[PDB]
């Protein structure tokens, strides 16, 4: 029925046509299927999804940066993503992600100052999430102490 309708339009029964490349002007070496597809623009616009963050506000307890574009959030560096750095060598990239990029409060400001000073040096510290963990275990009535060198 579709081929019969095409013949009524004087269009090809194959519904393939000769096409010419706009750039070269030369023909494509075989017939191409051309016609009308009804297309939809979905709600997923890049405008709404594009997001980027260098430094921003930080979470209340854990001191890690917030999540989500509405809260101007850093992307979550998950277990899965950490393991990838473990498989590689990448130990400095991982420490970065754990410390000056997340909790380490003194570390992040100090390294920001170094990057504007053009030092590109880390100077790592202690992640505030761990300080909390300690306090949460002592709140359970378990003595958890750091034993020195």
């Amino acid at each position: 029925e579709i081929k019969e309708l095409l013949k009524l339009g004087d269009l090809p029964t194959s519904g393939q046509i000769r096409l010419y490349d706009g750039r070269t002007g030369e023909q494509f070496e075989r017939p191409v299927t051309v016609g009308y597809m009804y297309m939809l623009k979905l709600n997923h616009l890049v405008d709404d999804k594009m997001h980027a963050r260098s430094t921003g506000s930080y979470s209340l307890v854990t001191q890690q940066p917030l999540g989500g574009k509405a809260q101007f959030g850093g992307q979550r560096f998950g277990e899965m993503e950490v393991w990838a750095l473990e498989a590689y060598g990448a130990a400095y990239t991982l420490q970065e992600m754990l410390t000056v990029k997340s909790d380490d409060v003194n570390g992040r400001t100090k390294m920001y100052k170094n990057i504007v000073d053009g030092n590109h040096q880390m100077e790592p510290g202690m992640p505030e999430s761990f300080n909390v963990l300690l306090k949460e275990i002592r709140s359970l009535g378990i003595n958890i102490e750091l034993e020195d060198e």
Binding site: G22, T24, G25, E26
Partner: protein
Amino acid sequence: TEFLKPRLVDIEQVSSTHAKVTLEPLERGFGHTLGNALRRILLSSMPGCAVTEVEIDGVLHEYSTKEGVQEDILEILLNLKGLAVRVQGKDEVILTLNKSGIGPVTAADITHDGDVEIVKPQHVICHLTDENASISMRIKVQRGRGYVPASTRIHSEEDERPIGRLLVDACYSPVERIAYNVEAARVEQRTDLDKLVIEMETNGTIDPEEAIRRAATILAEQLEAFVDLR
């Protein structure tokens, strides 16, 4: 080099919009060389005139609706994009359109300015429903080339922001369609000699003949750079 130049032979003008142009004689392979090169300039580079800014009295933004008018302002603006205009002397002209009463507002209701020429006076712009309703607007037509969207134009100059100016897309490019066919020109001796048949389809403004002349001019201008500087 037994150099063999083509010359413009036949200009079938089927309509003011559509015009076929045969071209001969062409040496083998120059049919496609000139055919595509010209098609590309004729689509992307052709200079023309188009509506850039529209200011309607009693209208602050393009999303509002004016009473006594069937079409929302957006739909009116889209009709003004299709308004075919020639400016003779100046690069920028502001035309005034004041009309009232029941009727389809056409392009002829714009105050005919001396140098400016409206190619399609019957072009529909607005439908006025109630007789008491009157519409008044100032349509700015600028000359440029190619396609300049209002979104690309709302992130460049913007030296003055007069609350009242609406930016709408204006396809400067007069050329709507173009295709070239290489046919055999069974020449006196040569059978590989060919003709170039350019089917052009413009809106108003540019003359087919004049447009081809201009496009060939632009290409030859760009070659001066290579023939000259080594």
